Amino acid sequence: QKYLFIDRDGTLISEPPSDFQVDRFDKLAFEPGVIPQLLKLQKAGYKLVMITNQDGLGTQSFPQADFDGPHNLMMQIFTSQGVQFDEVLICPHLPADECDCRKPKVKLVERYLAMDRANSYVIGDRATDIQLAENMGINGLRYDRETLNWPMIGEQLTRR
Amino acid sequence: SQKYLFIDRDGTLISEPPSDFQVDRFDKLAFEPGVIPQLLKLQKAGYKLVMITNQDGLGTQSFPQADFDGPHNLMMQIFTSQGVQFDEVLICPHLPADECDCRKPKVKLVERYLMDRANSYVIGDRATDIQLAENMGINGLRYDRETLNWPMIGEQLT
Ligand SMILES: N[C@H](CO)Cc1c[nH]c[nH+]1
Ligand SMILES: [Cl-]
Ligand SMILES: [Cl-]
Ligand SMILES: [Cl-]
Ligand SMILES: [Cl-]
Ligand SMILES: [Mg+2]
Ligand SMILES: [Mg+2]
Ligand SMILES: [Zn+2]
Ligand SMILES: [Zn+2]
Helix, strand or coil, rough: CEEEEECCECCCEEECCCCCCCCCCCHEEECHHHHHHHHHHHHCEEEEEEEECCCCCCCEEEEEHHHHHHHHHHHHHHHHCCEEEHHHHHHHHHHHCCCCCCCCCHHHHHHHHCCCCCCCCCECCCCCEEEEEHHHCCEEEECCCCCCCCCHHHHHCCCC | CEEEEECEECCCCCCCCCCCCCCCCCHHEEECCCCCCHHHHHCCCCCCEEEEEEECCCCEEEHHHHHHHHHHHHHHHHHHHCCCEEEEEECCCCHHHHCCCCCCCCCHHHHHHHCCCCCCCCEECCCCHHHHHHHHHCCCECCCCEEEHHHHHHHCCC
């Protein structure tokens, strides 16, 4: 079973450059082509898993209610359009917490470590996503809106 | 002559709030099933898209422009980022009691188009959308999430 482990902020949707928190609806923006390209990937047999660090989620620095509006709308778009994430895995911790689950640690995905490692990938926009791939023993794809975008990924991962 | 789809917004592209028929909060925004992939399919088949919507009392106390703008502009972001493009977004802001010239199924908003009529459609969830189609002299599709939905329309028209 081929899996795609996909980052949220800066990958599925844009990441706010001020505080890196999608905590208002006016900070929610989808990356280009993510919907048709995830549908394409699913049709080729990939299952999808979302994996994301959300520093301080559920605390006064990033209230659960502030995260929920934009996140739930994002998920309603995916689901209604036919994009299904098997799991949405979140680390809510601060870096200083030194938790077991903050990417690039693999705790959140331990159950997948089970899958076809040769044909599974982490997709994310940061060095930490690529390091997660290395820690998982799978391939890493560094999302970039210009140099490795959703259409390119959809093509690359369905090449035969 | 261009094939057009004239598509209603509320209850057709996005869910219609059952409470009060106004998408006036972000938390009332929800996309209809399959609308994105199907509109992309329809665009690839050569249809151009025009949105047309009655927004009762838009820009007054019971529906401020600012309340409409947030959810609408976000809906537009989502469609545009995913490759769905509307040539025009046509809005009637008036109350029914106003008895204006632009309220569907009156044809004012779309006068310019009055187009390959044999292959153009109004798609909407209300009888008035179907009447608009008749007044424009083109085909009408009565969108229903359960019985005549986006995958069905995408299949039929391609
Ligand atoms: N957006 C970052 C990565 O997903 C996590 C974060 C939340 N608050 C501040 N930083
Ligand atoms: Cl910002
Ligand atoms: Cl992250
Ligand atoms: Cl969020
Ligand atoms: Cl209407
Ligand atoms: Mg990221
Ligand atoms: Mg309607
Ligand atoms: Zn953690
Ligand atoms: Zn009017």
